Amino acid sequence: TRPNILVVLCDDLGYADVGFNGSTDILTPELDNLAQNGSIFTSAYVAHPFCGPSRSAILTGRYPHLTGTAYNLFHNSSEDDKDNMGVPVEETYMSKVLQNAGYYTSAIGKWHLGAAPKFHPNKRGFDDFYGFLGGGHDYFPSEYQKTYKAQKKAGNPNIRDYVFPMEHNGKPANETEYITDGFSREAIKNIKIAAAKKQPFFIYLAYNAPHVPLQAKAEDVAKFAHIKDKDRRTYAAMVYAVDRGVGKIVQTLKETKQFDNTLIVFLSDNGGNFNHGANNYPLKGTKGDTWEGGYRVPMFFHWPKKIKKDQRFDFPVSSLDLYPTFTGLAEAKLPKGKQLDGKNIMDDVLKNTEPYKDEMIYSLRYREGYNDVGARMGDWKITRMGNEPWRLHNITQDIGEKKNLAGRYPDRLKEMIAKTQEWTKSFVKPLWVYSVKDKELWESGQMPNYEATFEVDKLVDSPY
Amino acid sequence: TRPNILVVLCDDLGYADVGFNGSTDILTPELDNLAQNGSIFTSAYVAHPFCGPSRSAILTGRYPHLTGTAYNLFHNSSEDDKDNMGVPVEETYMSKVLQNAGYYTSAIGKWHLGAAPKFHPNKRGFDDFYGFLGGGHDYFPSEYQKTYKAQKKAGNPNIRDYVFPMEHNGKPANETEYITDGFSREAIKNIKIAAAKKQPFFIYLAYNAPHVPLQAKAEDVAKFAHIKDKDRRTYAAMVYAVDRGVGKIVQTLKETKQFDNTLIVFLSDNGGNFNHGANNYPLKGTKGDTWEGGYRVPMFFHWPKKIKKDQRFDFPVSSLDLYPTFTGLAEAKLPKGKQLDGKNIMDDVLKNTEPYKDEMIYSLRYREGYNDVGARMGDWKITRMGNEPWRLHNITQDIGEKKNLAGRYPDRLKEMIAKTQEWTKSFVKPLWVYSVKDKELWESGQMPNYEATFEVDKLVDSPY
Ligand SMILES: [Br-]
Ligand SMILES: [Br-]
Ligand SMILES: [Br-]
Ligand SMILES: [Br-]
Ligand SMILES: [Br-]
Ligand SMILES: [Br-]
Ligand SMILES: [Ca+2]
Ligand SMILES: [Ca+2]
Ligand SMILES: [Cl-]
Ligand SMILES: [Cl-]
Ligand SMILES: [Cl-]
Ligand SMILES: [Cl-]
Ligand SMILES: [Cl-]
Ligand SMILES: [Cl-]
Ligand SMILES: [Cl-]
Ligand SMILES: [Cl-]
Ligand SMILES: [Cl-]
Ligand SMILES: [Cl-]
Ligand SMILES: [Cl-]
Ligand SMILES: [Cl-]
Ligand SMILES: [Cl-]
Ligand SMILES: [Cl-]
């Protein structure tokens, strides 16, 4: 009997901001209990260090550099199909694949993969959608509904999508509670629906917490009243509210007897933003970086029927693995011609085998005139940040990327740079960029200039 | 009547790495006692976020962008006067000005302002020099002398200058102890020389501690044995050896009865490198950045005859202020046509008045194809890092530069950028650059492109 699949995806959760991954000040007892009863992934990576492209990769199973979606959609992006402001519809999502294999599919919370009808969740493999289409949202309906009406009362032609009414399959959601609590409430409802249907479920629970604005319930803040920094205190309360809902979700799974045969996957979509309450310790950097802190995230698998308790999986994996792993477990057939950049790791997880032995896990982030790069194989990682000289780290011994080994092992450095450059030969042009500056640089050819990105000696050689 | 002047300049000391500036694990009792008995500067800035240009600025009193010295000299730089690898000799150092006013002048420790004879300290106003000409040095003579000899006897043509013999006025120094201790002993020796000559002294004590290589005496490491991280522990021991030497220097000043009429200035030449043991809390960033962490440094003035005890000076100051402050105290006349970018602040310190009201304290750091910028006026700072969109901070309320207010106050942002851009209009071309990549970009005009640096709207506007 095929398992249910529950993906709990948080938004900008820092590497050190759940108990099972080292937090000393944020309490996440429900998440910790799930993690201790499953497999914790100590080297898990998303395919891009910020929101839109990471989510594009999770659902398409491809790097955003291959689908044209490596920039975020701007807020209030176009809602007209003629404008193709969304992930290409030809790139079939794993939700549609699971849907075509008889799964009850549900998407809750944040989307950010296109606000026009052809990009809507109900058209991309989801029987049920409850959430918002853009990149973020205010958390309290009492506050943001008032603002929305008032802004209509002045005929405001550019109302921020952070205050738009949310929707349930295209109709007004009429949410009445702190939206983290509402998304938990909708997850429970959809679990009860699938149980009543005696149908396996796939639920994509995309919390916007703890993404800005930092807004939290008074009852949650009180659990952290001793934290003096206000942003950290509020951020902790936000993470705690997600934890409360996972505990309620777990109770529902047990009452409906779906707990033992549900694969629960929990992760963050990118590294924490350390300007807005997050802590990525012991990693270097912040959301958006190709330092580990940008795209290495907490993650666990929990599936009592098959994954042993107290497991730690220390081999590097990618969020790109979720697509082939889920379609495999679903016994689903892939669409003809579907290209995938990850692999099914369920067997590797059960037997503690290395899925990426002698293979690369990459990141490339476009900047204003240059690219940040990161690439890991085994214990070795190469990094370029700020267009500075290339760095080589033994990421297993130097998790903080403090000791540059490029000088001691230049052969390894250039071999890893060679493979990474070849990878960028397969890229497509971005379907959209983010800023006016971006558009100029790509039109002038100043971007992408992958050739300059993979220079090595001239960055370090003296001309004298 | 005129005071003695002792400049204690550490190398790469982190903002939180002395007791008086908030350190909780590194002990600096001697430095703290001086600071408690003088004026602590809570918003002190050096003129560039790394070694060479900052030091050029301290001795010339000018921004390195105006003297052509905003890149480091490469290690083992040219020793022939013909190649002009050094600070322009026409830019008169404050040591020469003080020399010409009857001061006994002495330089100790690190130089890095040119290794050719016309750039030598003895030709730049220093009666005495004891140290090394380049940018760093190994700490234990038993080890680096052995290496230097072995490699000299093998005719190695590329001996690292980190192991060259140190010198005393052009002759071999024959150092026999941990060079931090060796430098302290020389400061004591030069204090007694000035006393015997019945001359006011100016001592430029340029410790290379706590700059890499992290090397410390075992007896000093033992005092920080509860520090678990090996690099943090050695670094703590290196800072401590500087503190011990400051205490011995203080004892000498009392025996020679020079203590009360000596102005002791203590500061770091730039922010701490957080990859090599330093801690810049609560600032953001690291050595080399235009975040506060790159160029805001600890600093105190200690001068019992005039400066009151337990003072805290909270208005922003610059290390460029030391040149006109010292010559003012020396009652010296400036060379005809000498340009200075700082101001005499001794009166402002004694009366607690604002030296930079409605005026700017700047930083601009060249990167590979773009510029990092920071500029502060009053409570307000603008920051551009990594060519990202411009940031505006109230650094008095937001010392960590976490909350960008550029959207909230675009009028202030644009006026501060306008003033900063006009400042860059006076810059000169670098006399040298640092890497081959640097040279290509400057010859093609890809650098400096100050015009692109001060773009604002195109970095945040959507093109759709
Ligand atoms: Br689809
Ligand atoms: Br709503
Ligand atoms: Br069950
Ligand atoms: Br930010
Ligand atoms: Br001079
Ligand atoms: Br020596
Ligand atoms: Ca995110
Ligand atoms: Ca330095
Ligand atoms: Cl609005
Ligand atoms: Cl940042
Ligand atoms: Cl089992
Ligand atoms: Cl090698
Ligand atoms: Cl384009
Ligand atoms: Cl090259
Ligand atoms: Cl020797
Ligand atoms: Cl050598
Ligand atoms: Cl005295
Ligand atoms: Cl470094
Ligand atoms: Cl760094
Ligand atoms: Cl304003
Ligand atoms: Cl040049
Ligand atoms: Cl502009």
PDB file of C-alpha atoms in Angstrom, chain B residues 129-277:
ATOM      1  CA  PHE B 129      63.158  51.762  12.998  1.00  0.00           C
ATOM      2  CA  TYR B 130      63.006  48.250  14.422  1.00  0.00           C
ATOM      3  CA  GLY B 131      60.858  45.772  12.504  1.00  0.00           C
ATOM      4  CA  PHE B 132      60.042  44.439   9.027  1.00  0.00           C
ATOM      5  CA  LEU B 133      59.218  46.221   5.805  1.00  0.00           C
ATOM      6  CA  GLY B 134      56.337  44.110   4.442  1.00  0.00           C
ATOM      7  CA  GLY B 135      52.831  43.211   5.524  1.00  0.00           C
ATOM      8  CA  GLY B 136      53.323  40.410   8.039  1.00  0.00           C
ATOM      9  CA  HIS B 137      55.808  38.152   9.752  1.00  0.00           C
ATOM     10  CA  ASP B 138      56.114  34.882  11.632  1.00  0.00           C
ATOM     11  CA  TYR B 139      56.345  35.288  15.422  1.00  0.00           C
ATOM     12  CA  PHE B 140      59.061  32.915  16.705  1.00  0.00           C
ATOM     13  CA  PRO B 141      62.672  33.722  15.728  1.00  0.00           C
ATOM     14  CA  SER B 142      63.904  30.219  16.569  1.00  0.00           C
ATOM     15  CA  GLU B 143      61.556  28.948  13.827  1.00  0.00           C
ATOM     16  CA  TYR B 144      61.706  31.575  11.101  1.00  0.00           C
ATOM     17  CA  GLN B 145      65.495  32.152  11.403  1.00  0.00           C
ATOM     18  CA  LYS B 146      66.055  28.424  10.966  1.00  0.00           C
ATOM     19  CA  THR B 147      63.802  28.395   7.894  1.00  0.00           C
ATOM     20  CA  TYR B 148      65.357  31.541   6.426  1.00  0.00           C
ATOM     21  CA  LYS B 149      68.882  30.184   6.817  1.00  0.00           C
ATOM     22  CA  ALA B 150      68.085  26.762   5.354  1.00  0.00           C
ATOM     23  CA  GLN B 151      66.387  28.333   2.343  1.00  0.00           C
ATOM     24  CA  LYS B 152      69.093  30.963   1.862  1.00  0.00           C
ATOM     25  CA  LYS B 153      71.763  28.257   1.840  1.00  0.00           C
ATOM     26  CA  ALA B 154      69.774  26.342  -0.783  1.00  0.00           C
ATOM     27  CA  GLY B 155      69.573  29.395  -3.043  1.00  0.00           C
ATOM     28  CA  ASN B 156      65.763  29.460  -2.919  1.00  0.00           C
ATOM     29  CA  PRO B 157      64.792  32.416  -5.159  1.00  0.00           C
ATOM     30  CA  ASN B 158      61.298  32.869  -3.645  1.00  0.00           C
ATOM     31  CA  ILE B 159      61.775  33.109   0.105  1.00  0.00           C
ATOM     32  CA  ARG B 160      58.619  34.451   1.715  1.00  0.00           C
ATOM     33  CA  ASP B 161      59.212  37.831   3.339  1.00  0.00           C
ATOM     34  CA  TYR B 162      57.342  36.500   6.404  1.00  0.00           C
ATOM     35  CA  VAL B 163      60.639  34.816   7.355  1.00  0.00           C
ATOM     36  CA  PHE B 164      63.170  37.534   6.351  1.00  0.00           C
ATOM     37  CA  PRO B 165      65.409  38.709   9.185  1.00  0.00           C
ATOM     38  CA  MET B 166      64.045  41.798  10.838  1.00  0.00           C
ATOM     39  CA  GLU B 167      66.187  44.905  10.836  1.00  0.00           C
ATOM     40  CA  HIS B 168      67.306  47.694  13.154  1.00  0.00           C
ATOM     41  CA  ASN B 169      67.954  50.777  11.004  1.00  0.00           C
ATOM     42  CA  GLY B 170      69.084  48.697   8.060  1.00  0.00           C
ATOM     43  CA  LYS B 171      71.265  46.279  10.069  1.00  0.00           C
ATOM     44  CA  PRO B 172      70.167  42.779  11.179  1.00  0.00           C
ATOM     45  CA  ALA B 173      67.950  42.864  14.272  1.00  0.00           C
ATOM     46  CA  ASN B 174      69.053  39.449  15.609  1.00  0.00           C
ATOM     47  CA  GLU B 175      65.719  39.046  17.380  1.00  0.00           C
ATOM     48  CA  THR B 176      65.656  36.418  20.131  1.00  0.00           C
ATOM     49  CA  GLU B 177      62.082  36.371  21.460  1.00  0.00           C
ATOM     50  CA  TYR B 178      58.430  36.215  20.407  1.00  0.00           C
ATOM     51  CA  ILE B 179      58.361  39.360  18.303  1.00  0.00           C
ATOM     52  CA  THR B 180      55.419  40.889  20.152  1.00  0.00           C
ATOM     53  CA  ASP B 181      57.579  40.763  23.270  1.00  0.00           C
ATOM     54  CA  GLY B 182      60.480  41.934  21.144  1.00  0.00           C
ATOM     55  CA  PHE B 183      58.500  44.940  19.958  1.00  0.00           C
ATOM     56  CA  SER B 184      57.508  45.864  23.502  1.00  0.00           C
ATOM     57  CA  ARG B 185      61.144  45.718  24.619  1.00  0.00           C
ATOM     58  CA  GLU B 186      62.060  48.107  21.790  1.00  0.00           C
ATOM     59  CA  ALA B 187      59.326  50.560  22.766  1.00  0.00           C
ATOM     60  CA  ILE B 188      60.713  50.593  26.305  1.00  0.00           C
ATOM     61  CA  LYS B 189      64.221  51.079  24.930  1.00  0.00           C
ATOM     62  CA  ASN B 190      63.117  53.986  22.766  1.00  0.00           C
ATOM     63  CA  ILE B 191      61.261  55.625  25.691  1.00  0.00           C
ATOM     64  CA  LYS B 192      64.514  55.638  27.688  1.00  0.00           C
ATOM     65  CA  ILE B 193      66.408  57.053  24.691  1.00  0.00           C
ATOM     66  CA  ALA B 194      63.979  59.974  24.393  1.00  0.00           C
ATOM     67  CA  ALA B 195      64.224  60.562  28.136  1.00  0.00           C
ATOM     68  CA  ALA B 196      68.041  60.638  27.984  1.00  0.00           C
ATOM     69  CA  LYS B 197      67.928  63.056  25.064  1.00  0.00           C
ATOM     70  CA  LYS B 198      65.443  65.201  27.059  1.00  0.00           C
ATOM     71  CA  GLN B 199      63.254  65.189  23.933  1.00  0.00           C
ATOM     72  CA  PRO B 200      59.524  64.524  23.497  1.00  0.00           C
ATOM     73  CA  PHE B 201      59.041  61.233  21.673  1.00  0.00           C
ATOM     74  CA  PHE B 202      56.723  60.033  18.929  1.00  0.00           C
ATOM     75  CA  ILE B 203      56.654  56.203  18.881  1.00  0.00           C
ATOM     76  CA  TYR B 204      54.761  54.358  16.138  1.00  0.00           C
ATOM     77  CA  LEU B 205      54.299  50.928  17.743  1.00  0.00           C
ATOM     78  CA  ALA B 206      52.849  48.804  14.907  1.00  0.00           C
ATOM     79  CA  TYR B 207      52.388  45.356  16.407  1.00  0.00           C
ATOM     80  CA  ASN B 208      51.537  42.747  13.837  1.00  0.00           C
ATOM     81  CA  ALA B 209      49.475  40.850  16.426  1.00  0.00           C
ATOM     82  CA  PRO B 210      46.822  39.481  16.150  1.00  0.00           C
ATOM     83  CA  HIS B 211      47.295  39.156  12.329  1.00  0.00           C
ATOM     84  CA  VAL B 212      47.955  35.672  10.895  1.00  0.00           C
ATOM     85  CA  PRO B 213      49.867  33.368  11.343  1.00  0.00           C
ATOM     86  CA  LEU B 214      48.105  32.548  14.621  1.00  0.00           C
ATOM     87  CA  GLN B 215      51.143  31.840  16.801  1.00  0.00           C
ATOM     88  CA  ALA B 216      51.270  32.233  20.547  1.00  0.00           C
ATOM     89  CA  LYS B 217      53.443  31.481  23.523  1.00  0.00           C
ATOM     90  CA  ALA B 218      52.349  28.447  25.539  1.00  0.00           C
ATOM     91  CA  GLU B 219      52.336  30.449  28.773  1.00  0.00           C
ATOM     92  CA  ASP B 220      49.873  32.886  27.201  1.00  0.00           C
ATOM     93  CA  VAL B 221      47.747  30.076  25.732  1.00  0.00           C
ATOM     94  CA  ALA B 222      47.497  28.573  29.223  1.00  0.00           C
ATOM     95  CA  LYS B 223      45.573  31.645  30.421  1.00  0.00           C
ATOM     96  CA  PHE B 224      42.801  30.879  27.906  1.00  0.00           C
ATOM     97  CA  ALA B 225      42.727  27.106  28.167  1.00  0.00           C
ATOM     98  CA  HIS B 226      38.942  27.090  28.731  1.00  0.00           C
ATOM     99  CA  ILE B 227      38.505  28.525  25.208  1.00  0.00           C
ATOM    100  CA  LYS B 228      37.612  25.449  23.151  1.00  0.00           C
ATOM    101  CA  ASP B 229      38.181  26.666  19.577  1.00  0.00           C
ATOM    102  CA  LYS B 230      41.888  26.396  18.839  1.00  0.00           C
ATOM    103  CA  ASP B 231      42.009  29.474  16.608  1.00  0.00           C
ATOM    104  CA  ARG B 232      40.045  31.650  19.045  1.00  0.00           C
ATOM    105  CA  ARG B 233      42.283  30.452  21.879  1.00  0.00           C
ATOM    106  CA  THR B 234      45.578  31.263  20.084  1.00  0.00           C
ATOM    107  CA  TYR B 235      44.190  34.622  18.948  1.00  0.00           C
ATOM    108  CA  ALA B 236      43.229  35.401  22.535  1.00  0.00           C
ATOM    109  CA  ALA B 237      46.771  34.549  23.614  1.00  0.00           C
ATOM    110  CA  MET B 238      48.180  36.857  20.888  1.00  0.00           C
ATOM    111  CA  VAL B 239      46.056  39.797  21.995  1.00  0.00           C
ATOM    112  CA  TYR B 240      47.087  39.051  25.565  1.00  0.00           C
ATOM    113  CA  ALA B 241      50.796  39.275  24.773  1.00  0.00           C
ATOM    114  CA  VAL B 242      50.128  42.773  23.401  1.00  0.00           C
ATOM    115  CA  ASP B 243      48.379  43.665  26.664  1.00  0.00           C
ATOM    116  CA  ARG B 244      51.338  42.388  28.737  1.00  0.00           C
ATOM    117  CA  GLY B 245      53.675  44.580  26.703  1.00  0.00           C
ATOM    118  CA  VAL B 246      51.457  47.613  27.121  1.00  0.00           C
ATOM    119  CA  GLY B 247      51.728  47.050  30.886  1.00  0.00           C
ATOM    120  CA  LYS B 248      55.520  46.946  30.762  1.00  0.00           C
ATOM    121  CA  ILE B 249      55.493  50.095  28.615  1.00  0.00           C
ATOM    122  CA  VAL B 250      53.279  51.762  31.204  1.00  0.00           C
ATOM    123  CA  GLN B 251      55.719  50.815  33.982  1.00  0.00           C
ATOM    124  CA  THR B 252      58.560  52.415  32.034  1.00  0.00           C
ATOM    125  CA  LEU B 253      56.579  55.611  31.484  1.00  0.00           C
ATOM    126  CA  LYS B 254      56.096  55.928  35.245  1.00  0.00           C
ATOM    127  CA  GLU B 255      59.752  55.260  36.090  1.00  0.00           C
ATOM    128  CA  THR B 256      60.868  57.877  33.583  1.00  0.00           C
ATOM    129  CA  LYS B 257      58.074  60.086  35.025  1.00  0.00           C
ATOM    130  CA  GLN B 258      56.708  60.570  31.482  1.00  0.00           C
ATOM    131  CA  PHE B 259      53.306  58.921  32.116  1.00  0.00           C
ATOM    132  CA  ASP B 260      51.113  61.936  32.916  1.00  0.00           C
ATOM    133  CA  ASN B 261      52.297  64.036  29.928  1.00  0.00           C
ATOM    134  CA  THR B 262      52.137  61.236  27.325  1.00  0.00           C
ATOM    135  CA  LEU B 263      49.189  60.932  24.935  1.00  0.00           C
ATOM    136  CA  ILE B 264      48.696  57.192  24.350  1.00  0.00           C
ATOM    137  CA  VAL B 265      46.462  56.391  21.358  1.00  0.00           C
ATOM    138  CA  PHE B 266      45.391  52.770  20.934  1.00  0.00           C
ATOM    139  CA  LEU B 267      43.559  51.494  17.860  1.00  0.00           C
ATOM    140  CA  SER B 268      43.372  48.746  15.242  1.00  0.00           C
ATOM    141  CA  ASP B 269      44.298  49.349  11.634  1.00  0.00           C
ATOM    142  CA  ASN B 270      41.042  47.745  10.397  1.00  0.00           C
ATOM    143  CA  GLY B 271      38.281  45.362  11.423  1.00  0.00           C
ATOM    144  CA  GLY B 272      38.887  41.831  12.608  1.00  0.00           C
ATOM    145  CA  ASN B 273      39.006  38.941  10.117  1.00  0.00           C
ATOM    146  CA  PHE B 274      36.381  36.592  11.483  1.00  0.00           C
ATOM    147  CA  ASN B 275      37.931  33.643   9.610  1.00  0.00           C
ATOM    148  CA  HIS B 276      41.099  33.891  11.735  1.00  0.00           C
ATOM    149  CA  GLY B 277      39.925  34.165  15.310  1.00  0.00           C
TER     150      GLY B 277
END
